[PDB]
């Protein structure tokens, strides 16, 4: 069974260096070219380079986007390919996949690793502020009210949101976080509930941001408008 | 570089149906140098077809490829539930190697118009100097919708951000948030905050609005 396992990803400042490893198993690694492919958040696939086998000269090719900054190397005695990323830019933020290049005349990428995430950011750790998205006549449709919590300006990912300590789950929508121009993330978590329950039930969003040790249990109270 | 243009952007189909995906190259590409990859939600891509028409190891028979020159096609003869994924073509005959932008094969359902909800900024946030107004579009399909922010009837641009959920595993719908963010000072200069929503399932736009200080 062919397996490729990337490691070395993490959070890094622009301009810094980071080396990714790809541990290969299940094949004669030394005979194969290897290639790195990356996927920015919400985007497609971008080739970032290949390295030939030693028999084929063991040299590399990279596209202009990373040429002169990223270097691919390999240790065939350890069955490891490397991606040395220097002069990192925020735009290099992506999941980085190690891939095996197939032998022969049609050198497709026959096998892919699970990927390792590289986040290039000049933002410092910040716990979120948690604001109620209060239910009102403006968030009531039929017998159903929507309510939520705005989890604003945190870094890094992720935050977790539960509702009423996990007793509220159906119709919960915790949206993918959005990166703001501040370099900080924000998301909302919303849930739809019976309008009648706004009088009997207490709605609390439980927000956890581990990197800042932030825990917030925010009560979401109805408005009268 | 050789640009690979895939079409359509999203293929909305049911299990059992035939899927036909197109990849158009900006110049002639030898069929030897074209491949197709599948990326399932939350997973790495995997090779499906190489050399335009050859199935990769372990790839089921329902996947086939054909084409030459600039026009290439991936066919899934009978969609299985696991086939709903994003598909990328790739050329590796010219440097740099390039990928198409991807075609999403999405599970189809009947049209559902969004329920629309608006949330005024909280007093807590306003005290800290910022005002975020959130407009929620719940459980709609298809994915395309438009949220327009109007502040005293003035269309807003450049001060809002949208987030869309993944297609729901239970009802196959999408939900969407749009967040308008103003400074406290700017927020206090205006009165009527409205999000106006259109969706192909709505016969006329749905507007949810509040007045500053109403809530």
């Amino acid at each position: 069974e062919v397996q490729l396992v990337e490691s070395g990803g993490g959070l890094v400042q622009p301009g810094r260096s980071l080396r990714l490893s790809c541990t290969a198993s299940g094949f004669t690694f030394g005979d194969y070219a290897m290639s790195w492919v990356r996927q920015a958040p919400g985007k497609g696939l971008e080739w970032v380079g290949f390295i030939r086998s030693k028999a084929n000269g063991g040299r590399t090719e990279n596209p202009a986007s990373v040429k002169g900054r990223f270097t691919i190397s390999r240790d065939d005695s350890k069955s490891i390919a490397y991606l040395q990323m220097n002069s990192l830019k925020t735009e290099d933020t992506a999941v980085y996949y190690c891939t095996r290049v197939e032998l022969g005349s049609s050198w497709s990428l026959g096998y892919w690793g699970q990927g390792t995430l590289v986040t290039v950011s000049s933002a410092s750790t910040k716990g979120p502020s948690v604001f109620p998205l209060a239910p009102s006549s403006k968030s009531t449709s039929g017998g159903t009210a929507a309510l939520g919590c705005l989890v604003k300006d945190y870094f890094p990912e992720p935050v977790t949101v539960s509702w009423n300590s996990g007793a509220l789950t159906s119709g919960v929508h915790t949206f993918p976080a959005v990166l703001q121009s501040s370099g900080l993330y924000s998301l909302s978590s919303v849930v739809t509930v019976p309008s009648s329950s706004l009088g009997t039930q207490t709605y609390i969003c439980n927000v956890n941001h581990k990197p800042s040790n932030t825990k917030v249990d925010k009560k979401v109270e109805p408005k009268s408008c | 570089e050789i640009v690979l243009t895939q079409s359509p952007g999203t293929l909305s189909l049911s299990p059992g149906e035939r899927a036909t995906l197109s990849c158009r190259a900006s110049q002639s590409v030898s069929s030897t140098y074209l491949a197709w990859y599948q990326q399932k939600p939350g997973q790495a891509p995997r090779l499906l077809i190489y050399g335009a028409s050859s199935r990769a190891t372990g790839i089921p028979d329902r996947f086939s490829g054909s084409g030459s020159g600039t026009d290439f096609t991936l066919t899934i003869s009978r969609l299985e539930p696991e086939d709903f994924a994003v598909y990328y073509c790739q050329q590796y005959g010219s440097s740099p190697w390039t990928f198409g932008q991807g075609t999403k094969v999405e599970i189809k359902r009947t049209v559902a118009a969004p329920s629309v909800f608006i949330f005024p900024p909280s007093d807590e946030q306003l005290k800290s100097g910022t005002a975020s107004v959130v407009c929620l579009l719940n459980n709609f399909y298809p994915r395309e919708a438009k949220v327009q922010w109007k502040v005293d009837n003035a269309l807003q641009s450049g001060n809002s951000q949208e987030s869309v959920t993944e297609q729901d595993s239970k009802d196959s719908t999408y939900s969407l948030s749009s967040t308008l963010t103003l400074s406290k000072a700017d927020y206090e200069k205006h009165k009527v905050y409205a999000c106006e929503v259109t969706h192909q399932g709505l016969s006329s736009p749905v507007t949810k609005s509040f007045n500053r200080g109403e809530c």
Partner: peptide
């Protein structure tokens, strides 16, 4: 294929 696109041959 141009040499810089071919990973399976010594250029």
């Amino acid at each position: 294929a141009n040499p810089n696109a071919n990973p399976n041959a010594n250029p």
